[PDB]
Amino acid sequence: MIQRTPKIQVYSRHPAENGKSNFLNCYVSGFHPSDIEVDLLKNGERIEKVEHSDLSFSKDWSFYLLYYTEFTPTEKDEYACRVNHVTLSQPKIVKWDRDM
């Protein structure tokens, strides 16, 4: 492979409000090859019910996937996405920030 490392965005579907149900998204894109491991984390624990989109790719042939789960944000709880790929020496963790 040439190899391309994934870009990662972590974000809520809707503006976040404590106590209101929402979806936590981790959008991984711009990677090649396609094998990729993506977890969503709550206070560092893996979230089990996570869904994802079907693999597709962009104009440059790089891949993209959306991983997501329903969640209810609170003042205390920290959320993050952890990604591993052959281009990473160890998994990359990206914490969720509410205005990004």
Name the site residues for other proteins (rule: CB under 8 A): 1-2, 4, 7, 9, 11, 13, 23, 25, 27, 29, 32-35, 53-57, 61-63, 66, 68, 99-100
Kindly state the smallest distance separating residue 18's Cβ from other proteins, in Å: 18
Q: How far apart are CA 99 and CA 11, in angstroms?
A: 8
Breaks (C-N over 2.5 A) in the chain follow: none
Enter the tokens of residue 33.
């090859």
DSSP secondary structure letter of residue 44: T
Q: For residues 28 and 41, which CB has a smaller minimum distance to other proteins in the complex?
A: 28
Kindly state the smallest distance separating residue 44's Cβ from other proteins, in Å: 23
